[PDB]
Amino acid sequence: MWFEVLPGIAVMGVCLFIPGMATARIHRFSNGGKEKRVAHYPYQWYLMERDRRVSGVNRSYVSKGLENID
Amino acid sequence: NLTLNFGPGVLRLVMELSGEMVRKCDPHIGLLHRGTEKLIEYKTYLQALPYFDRLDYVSMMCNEQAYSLAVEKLLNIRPPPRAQWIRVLFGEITRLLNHIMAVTTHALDIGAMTPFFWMFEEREKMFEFYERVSGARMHAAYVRPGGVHQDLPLGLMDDIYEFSKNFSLRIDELEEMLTNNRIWRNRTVDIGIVTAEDALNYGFSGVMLRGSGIQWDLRKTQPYDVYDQVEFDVPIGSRGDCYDRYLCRVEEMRQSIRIISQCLNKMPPGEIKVDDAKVSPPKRAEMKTSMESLIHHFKLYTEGYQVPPGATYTAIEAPKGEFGVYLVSDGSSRPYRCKIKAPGFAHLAGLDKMSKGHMLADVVAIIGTQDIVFGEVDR
């Protein structure tokens, strides 16, 4: 019957879900639980590099708040 | 120009191409020539009957009918009425088998693959009517000179009625896929136009004539069996192209349900082979108690009945066109000459003309519209 076609779709559906999920999870793992920074224009890249010089560690995804200003 | 070699029934087209167009088309046949017309000269008349199931192997029982009418004409006998109604009944169940093959394979060649599967579960049910009367799904050898082999089993006409009561919806679904489809009309309209005078002079018959507007059907002009006691209409085309012939075949399938509806209601009682034991074998229960009936069973199955000398061209309205046999007899139990007039032989001879000024992809559509089976073209 027609529902004996779904198992093939379910396997194919899962295979197309993995690439989007893995990319979403790997980005957050490598950027401290946040979205990856998108830098399409130079001004965005200048702010990302400045963030890398402000954290102390060479990571642009480590944010310093008001605690760092005295 | 680009002389290509297309092919591997099996055909060998040797086409001369100048770009997309076709310049000359040369069909090379004989890839399925088997020497049937020479093998029949070594067989008795009964032994030659199965040879006719294998000429047009989509319209088996129509070929048998043509051979029986010819022999019955030279034998000067007449099959009983119940045999004739059976032969019209199974002569039209066979027209459905041929038109399904002729329309859905035509569609299969040009990309439409789904209708083939729908209507081959309808052919499969009709093959069970062949199997239940003769024991063979395709090559029944059920129609024989003098009538038919056996009577219909009890409960067969009910299943033909149940089947034929749903077959009009199956056609309608086929016509939904094709009739109004623009892709299917662009492949057929104004393809393979044939004028009436060319169709007559080139030897065409069947839909190849009626697609061009000629009013001619042998079932109505030279009736055989009981075709004058049933009512049906003859589809006629107007353009003379592939699309009109396609419609003519879909309307014939509708008119055969009309004929089958009547053969079921008007079936008479009686015997199913001529009550003349020098032509048709006796019943088995009298072969085992009567002295004369054992002598004739012995002679009919070793020597066979003798046909009086003479020659006859006997043709019928087979699904693919006029099918006839020129059968010569010398007075013995074996035919002296049996020329088989295969309609596809004349049609395939007009492929070159019908393909004038068409692309290479239209030659496929033209061959399908002629409904060519190379069992009969090559014999």
Binding site: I18, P19, G20, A24, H27, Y41 | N186, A361
Partner: protein, 318 residues
């Protein structure tokens, strides 16, 4: 961690292709009043695996008089490009976030025409060279419309970034204001990927042979893999372009589930169409592009360049 990301893209793509063959063979069968693969494994779930192993332990027949270097190049280029078109897709986060993602997709797509030409050139048959020149002529013709239709949609989106199409369609799908383009875009993708009713070379079998009819064994499986990956890729492109999904940065999985469902319904519409219509003649699919689509696409490109200006609806550049 990036090298892990690439393998979470390539490997699941091939698995999807392998099981698109099963899904196609069963959807076709049920539209034909039959079942399809249900013997090799439960419901045919092992059928894709059996075919792959069969093709890769067969004789890879290469003709003696074939240019060996190009005979090998064609399947490498076909499969290599197929996987390269998946790197910028926002599902919802691209592997490579390109500022010109839409333009990159067009370029790689136009390179795939070489695999068709090299395959027919390297076989020395002339039964496969005519098919190659016919397929090459069909593919270059129908990528004129793709480039113009794509351009028209980007005039409501404002840039070439694929991630921006998710923001253009944050209130409404683009299929409403652009269904005339979607209809022609959808049919163009059928003509690009040599799908029925535009399959005059893959499996015409009407006094015409395909360009890769001389291939066998493993090399053939590489042409087949690339062809089906592009089918899935082109329907993912259609979902992002006209049926955009809503993106929630805290639940990116919601986007992926909905985005995957639309991509499957669009991929099952390629199987649905193949079971329903006959195939065009060669001249008829050329007249469909040069005399019907291109005249309308040029008119709609003029219309979509001035509609934003006349309604004060020009999108943002960034």
């Amino acid at each position: 961690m990036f090298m892990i990301n690439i393998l979470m893209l390539i490997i699941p793509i091939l698995l999807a292709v392998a099981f698109l063959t099963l899904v196609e063979r069963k959807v076709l069968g049920y539209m034909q009043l039959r079942k399809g693969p249900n013997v090799v494994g439960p419901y045919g779930l092992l059928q894709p695996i059996a075919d792959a192993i069969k093709l890769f332990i067969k004789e890879p027949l290469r003709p003696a008089t074939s240019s060996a270097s190009m005979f090998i190049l064609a399947p490498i280029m076909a499969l290599g490009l197929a996987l390269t078109m998946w790197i910028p897709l926002p599902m919802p986060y691209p592997l490579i976030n390109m500022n010109l993602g839409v333009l990159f997709m067009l370029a790689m797509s136009s390179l795939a025409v070489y695999s068709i030409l090299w395959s027919g050139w390297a076989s020395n048959s002339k039964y496969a060279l005519i098919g190659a020149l016919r397929a090459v002529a069909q593919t270059i013709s129908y990528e004129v419309t793709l480039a113009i239709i794509l351009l028209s949609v980007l005039l409501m989106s404002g840039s070439f970034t694929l991630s921006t199409l998710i923001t253009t369609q944050e209130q409404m799908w683009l299929i409403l204001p652009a269904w005339p383009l979607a209809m022609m875009w959808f049919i163009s993708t059928l003509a690009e990927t040599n799908r029925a009713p535009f399959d005059l070379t893959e499996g015409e079998s009407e006094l015409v042979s395909g360009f890769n009819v001389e291939y066998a064994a493993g090399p053939f499986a590489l042409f087949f893999m690339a062809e089906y990956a592009n089918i899935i890729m082109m329907n993912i492109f259609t979902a992002i372009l006209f049926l955009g999904t809503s993106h929630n940065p805290h639940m990116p999985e919601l986007y992926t589930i909905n985005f995957t469902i639309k991509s499957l319904l669009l991929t099952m519409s390629f199987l649905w169409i193949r079971a329903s219509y006959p195939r065009f003649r060669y001249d008829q699919l050329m007249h469909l592009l040069w005399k019907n689509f291109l005249p309308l696409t040029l008119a709609l490109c003029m219309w979509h360049v001035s509609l934003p200006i006349l309604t004060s609806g020009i999108p943002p550049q960034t």
